[PDB]
Amino acid sequence: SNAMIFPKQYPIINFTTAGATVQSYTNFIRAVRGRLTTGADVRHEIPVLPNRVGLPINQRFILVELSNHAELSVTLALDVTNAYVVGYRAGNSAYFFHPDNQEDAEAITHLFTDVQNRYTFAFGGNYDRLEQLAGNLRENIELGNGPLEEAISALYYYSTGGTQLPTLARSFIICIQMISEAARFQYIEGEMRTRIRYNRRSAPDPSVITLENSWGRLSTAIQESNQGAFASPIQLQRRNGSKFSVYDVSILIPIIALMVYRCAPP
Ligand SMILES: Cc1cc(F)cc(C)c1-c1ccc(C(=O)O)s1
Ligand SMILES: [Cl-]
Ligand SMILES: [Cl-]
Ligand SMILES: [Cl-]
Ligand SMILES: [Cl-]
Ligand code: NI
Ligand code: NI
Ligand code: NI
Ligand code: NI
């Protein structure tokens, strides 16, 4: 059995806006969640993402290939430890957000290794920076199948001089929410399902934005809880922006679908 055969790239999950339905989007998010988790670490019915410490590099990333009606394709790279986009490939070029630390900087050298042209943005992929570059808040950027179709084209046309940085940043904001944040939250997945079901494009309201902002804090609160009870409340927001507190994991079980690993399971 002399000659060894190796895999040549990370797992790929495909989604196209051309013919997208509630069902095809649901199947896509379900498959992304299935690739992000082992299903062996589930706490209070909420799957936990793999622990970064000691994670083999061939387990570190998954690829999401997006296509639209123009058959333009871009491939996003997601870090399985936090479900978040670290960069993307369009044709012969790959673009990475500035890594948050040297560990992540090392990991992304393993991505898209056959690509001819590699680039790193000086800015990270966090919403605060992307909003500044886009000149627009998440609150003012429409989401839906139409926005996603446009975002795919903008990412694709960045290499050949079409797309400018403000539009690129806006397009990242769209992709990250419709893929990463939907994978993280059944609530945000459901918001996107409703937009697709009724052919709507609307910006996310404060309940979505505050969940996105609070995902890391919710993961810590749940994993360090006492039988699901938080030592201190987490403050979230309703659709109209009014604040409210969550004291226990039970109300979050239909809301959050994935958590970043914080500590070992019991
Ligand atoms: C009930 C709940 C528990 C959570 F842990 C997080 C959220 C965002 C919610 C909301 C669902 C709908 C809301 C509205 O209609 O304002 S608030
Ligand atoms: Cl529980
Ligand atoms: Cl490094
Ligand atoms: Cl542009
Ligand atoms: Cl522990
Ligand atoms: Ni730097
Ligand atoms: Ni904000
Ligand atoms: Ni702990
Ligand atoms: Ni623990």
Numbering used by the authors: -3 to 262
What does the paper say about this structure?
Ricin contains an active A subunit (RTA) and a B subunit (RTB), which promotes retrograde transport into the endoplasmic reticulum (ER). RTA and Stx2A1 are ribosome inactivating proteins (RIPs), which remove a highly conserved adenine base (A4324 in rat) from the sarcin/ricin loop (SRL) of the 28S rRNA, leading to the inhibition of translation, ribotoxic stress, and apoptosis. We showed that RTA is recruited to the SRL by binding first to a conserved sequence at the C-terminal domain (CTD) of ribosomal P-stalk proteins. The X-ray crystal structure analysis showed that RTA binds the last six amino acids of P11 in a hydrophobic pocket at its CTD.
